[PDB]
Amino acid sequence: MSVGFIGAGQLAFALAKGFTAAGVLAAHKIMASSPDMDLATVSALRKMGVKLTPHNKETVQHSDVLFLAVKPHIIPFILDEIGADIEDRHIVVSCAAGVTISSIEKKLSAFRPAPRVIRCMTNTPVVVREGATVYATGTHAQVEDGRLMEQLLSSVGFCTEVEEDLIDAVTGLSGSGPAYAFTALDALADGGVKMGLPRRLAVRLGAQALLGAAKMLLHSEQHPGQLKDNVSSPGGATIHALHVLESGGFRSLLINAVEASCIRTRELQSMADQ
Amino acid sequence: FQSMSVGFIGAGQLAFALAKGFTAAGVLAAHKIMASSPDMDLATVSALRKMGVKLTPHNKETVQHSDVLFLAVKPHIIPFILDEIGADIEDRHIVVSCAAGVTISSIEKKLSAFRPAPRVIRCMTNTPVVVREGATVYATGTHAQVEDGRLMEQLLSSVGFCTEVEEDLIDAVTGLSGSGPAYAFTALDALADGGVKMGLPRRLAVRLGAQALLGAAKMLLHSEQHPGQLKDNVSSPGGATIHALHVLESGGFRSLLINAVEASCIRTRELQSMADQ
Amino acid sequence: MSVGFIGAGQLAFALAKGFTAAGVLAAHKIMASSPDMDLATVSALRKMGVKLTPHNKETVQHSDVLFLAVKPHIIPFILDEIGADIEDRHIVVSCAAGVTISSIEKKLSAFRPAPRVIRCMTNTPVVVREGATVYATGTHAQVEDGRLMEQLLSSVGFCTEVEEDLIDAVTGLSGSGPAYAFTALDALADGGVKMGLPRRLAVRLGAQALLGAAKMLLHSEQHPGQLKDNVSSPGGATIHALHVLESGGFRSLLINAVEASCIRTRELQSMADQE
Amino acid sequence: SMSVGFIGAGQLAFALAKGFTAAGVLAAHKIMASSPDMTVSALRKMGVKLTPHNKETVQHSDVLFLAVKPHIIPFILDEIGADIEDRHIVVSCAAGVTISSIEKKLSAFRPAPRVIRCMTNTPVVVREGATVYATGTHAQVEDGRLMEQLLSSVGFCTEVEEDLIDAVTGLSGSGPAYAFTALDALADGGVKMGLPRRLAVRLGAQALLGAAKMLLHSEQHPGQLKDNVSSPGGATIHALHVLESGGFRSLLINAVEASCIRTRELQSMADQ
Amino acid sequence: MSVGFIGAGQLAFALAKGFTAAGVLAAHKIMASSPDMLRKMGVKLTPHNKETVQHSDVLFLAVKPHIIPFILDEIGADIEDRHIVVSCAAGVTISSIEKKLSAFRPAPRVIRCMTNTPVVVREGATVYATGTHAQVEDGRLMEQLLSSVGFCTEVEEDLIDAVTGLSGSGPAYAFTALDALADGGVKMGLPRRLAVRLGAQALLGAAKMLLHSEQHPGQLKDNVSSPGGATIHALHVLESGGFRSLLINAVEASCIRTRELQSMADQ
């Protein structure tokens, strides 16, 4: 199997870092192309052993699975450039937020019939092999292509198939999720610093607390409210802190965030289709 | 130290999580663990019973059984325990208090009445030790030999992060990583509600939000970059993420988490001043 | 067994009505006294068959179990009024919010030693036999007294023993709780009316919704968050309504309420201990 | 002799099947449930015949509950519309879905379908549901009476005009979730003031149940019952004040309104 | 004079109770009809709307606003020259009513009014507008009949939706305020029964003061508040919550909804 990346941004580096750390891909079996060959991420890939080239056509010719790791508004221009170079062996995997399978297939179909397209939403934690990935299969993605992509993406985190009409909501939850967590961890650390902890120790403790709680939930058959109840001793410090969260509408803010991200994702695609 | 006996006074959530973590790490055999509780009809008690942990209603037997003795009872019960088993403390014992707010000097004062130089360690840990990803800090008491702290850190590092701190930091650690898991559980419930509002099935929404949090936290622990920089790397210009971050800022999301750490730390200090009275 | 009520107000009527509906006591075996024999509760008690008298001493002499259903600050004047009339057979059951076992025992002990005192916190839904009652036992309240107490009060709702130091918080939750629900049901009916429902129907539907939800939780081994998860279909009407509750800090308001009730209960006793 | 079927085996189908069996109005073997992916070990232990095929449930049943997500109703109706017989009563439990849209789809197969629309809720599982129904064009006077007797066995039930069901959805349909949220928060409050969690949850739920039963059995306004519990200067009126200061009442009006408005939106999307 | 009511809800009961208490009409000269079947007063009843029409000279339409067009088409052919039709329905225009009734007989005599429930204690607040064929004697007879149970004055029809938001919905604003003022009295230690009576008397007394005064309500507010005193402290916490803006919001919200409802009726 030969994997290629169109784009050499953060997600291209993240996935190639995870894939090779997982030992599922030899770094030299991965080719990446960038329009800005002086990127910080392009220099990192060259050290890993990832083959590099400025021409997207080189990436198409050298790969079987083809990740589109470009900005959403760049997808149509990439598809126009490489469309005549797609062969029957290709699986085209768009990672762009919002961009639909139908729009990709329509562009590629003008060149050759029956493009094999898969759409996915992943996130940056694939770089430490703890990503969250969903994918949906296009019209001509044979039953094997989805299972192949799930095997590949499972090596860097959780991965499952969804209906495509859920991917915008997933984007608002696990696609944007890490940024919510980085904000929360920065603020939790400021809280620790306010109460007298050194900054380095506060970041470590807050981050370990979030990782541990999330692992607990994933490994538990209990509701998050039940796990919350087990932390909060009657009259104790935790339930006092939980109350001030509630007084600020903490829960509503995170609902607001998933909603706003999902709505914007739909808007960006409506702008694309217009 | 695979011949050491560990005892828990208290058989609640913290005793169970530490006992599960320790045996899951395979650093202690479950039958080498004894726990004592005044209420035996607790769910955690039946759990400990099935693990193979020895259960007893008498704190004295836990003391005679143990080398390391965790005090995993509610903070205001600690002085009652110290009076009960203080005459049973022997030279071999290391007493590890897990009670929020209770000071090393308050423990050493009660125990020194019975026999001098009690070996006392105060720690603050959290429930994720049950999946070996806890966050533990400890402070060493007056007669806690350098070897006792090193033993303590070796033991608690088997179930997550562990480091020594000065004792005057522990109340603030309590508000951050002690209470921290409940902030995350609340956030994960809410994020899952957000996914459900936007059309996702609950089970999938819970899993995605939890995986997102775990992945982000691991990224930061493995990164040499500021969390603000990692946040910047996620936010595409004009995109969905920066739109979501704006609505969090408009609600004072950052300030609420600062409020929580402060409120928990302050309450922890209050609990000790009520005991001190 | 003969039961007495010092005070003939809402709580005495509620308990007496539930007891006689449960069939654990005949109405003629209940005596109630009140400093004001013109209340609507007194007229309802008379029609029920309850004996009514203006003299608290008559109630003490009639009864085996003696409930103190007066306002909290009236208790010290009651205990001084009838302390010398307390006999060995009496179990004194204080229903007054805040008033501690120690304060009652201290005033009664000046007359005869070893008064049998129970402190309880109940609520008005005992009148339909669905109350929430907790009780704590005094120093001389033998094991049979609490067991008898729990048997009597279990006939009109949930009843369990607690440590006394929990009762002020219970007062904030189940003691004041019915008022929180009456407010909620008034508001839910207003929302139904805003959206086009007749008032009478909106009140019936909202009350039925709250009753069934509460019974579901009581009969389930599942967390209330899981039950909430079960009713909220993805993208649906319920999760949209829950969002607007969260945006107003709905959860925090109810936490505020239990806290404020409990704190006030503590303040009231501190003022009494000062007097 | 009446046979009941369920197209969908979700929360609502399980809840109605559980309440109906607890009520003894239906033997569990007279109940069939169908789902694309299945609660399977639950209903089989309960005695409910299960099957993956919707046509089997139609062929087995006299009364046919449609307990699928609202946007799945058109695909169900087109799948089994040709299997509907004269004996069938079709009871839609989907939120927002109109009688006229069900009758329109079914009338393409056979004239005069007997359609009833209802809005019920999950406490039917403990036989304390709140149910309203509206009768369709060809639902004879007998069908609404039969539906009301069946659903009255698992809680409150009454006929309404169909134009009220979206509002009912926002009140008693979504209501239980408002209650579970409140009970979780009331228990947090008890825990903050020192109660064990288990006991706090029990006391809060009992208080809610008792208050609701009081109102249902009382000839008085809920504000009068609220007055009767708040003694002057006491703990309750202090607690009521902090609820008023947060706009507690307005939040519950907001919820009923938001649920009703969404229910209308869900149908306007299906009609489009 | 013969007075009839179509609809038998709160408004019909309020007006009938006020009219008889005022002594302008004997109860037996009044007839009310309703589909959902006052009798103790002596007011004749019937389920048929045509009977009320054939009995009455003045015909009050106290039905819900969305039922008015159904009533007009039901009784339109029985409207006769002697009839004055008085619509109490919120929002419903004189022109919509006259258009309905003119398809049966020309020049219907139509009056539109906005009253409120305190007519039952003869302290209502009523405004009315006269239709195209309401001879000037019909407005005078209307103001005469309605002044016996409260304030009554003629207005241009385009003000009635605003009036509805002020004095039509206003009693509900007051009942909410009186319930809350009572909760305040109870919080501060008063018995509930006494707190209700004191708050209501305070509100009644201040309203009457303003009505019998030539002074601005701010001037009367100044006369109550002594410097540094309890009242001015209380007014501050009202201002801090934006109390004034809430009542403006209420009048506006009610007026706007009244217009929405009529716009839905027109379409």
Ligand code: PRO
């Ligand atoms: O997700 C989608 O839309 C397509 C349809 C069936 C499988 N994948």
Ligand code: PRO
């Ligand atoms: O709630 C409390 O008081 C303890 C301290 C941190 C975890 N739980």
Ligand code: PRO
């Ligand atoms: O932090 C404390 O209190 C002691 C002093 C040095 C080590 N541990």
Ligand code: PRO
């Ligand atoms: O911000 C955006 O548009 C994408 C969505 C998840 C991460 N970046």
Ligand code: PRO
């Ligand atoms: O709770 C109390 O005050 C006492 C102590 C043991 C039984 N009742």
Ligand code: PRO
């Ligand atoms: O959320 C919804 O759309 C439906 C309405 C009541 C229960 N669930």
Ligand code: PRO
């Ligand atoms: O409620 C409805 O819309 C129809 C009309 C009469 C009976 N059911």
Ligand code: PRO
């Ligand atoms: O209002 C009070 O003070 C008492 C305590 C709970 C019920 N009523």
Ligand code: PRO
């Ligand atoms: O107020 C109106 O609309 C009409 C015009 C003059 C008299 N009545």
Ligand code: PRO
């Ligand atoms: O302002 C004051 O202090 C007095 C009290 C009632 C009226 N004015």
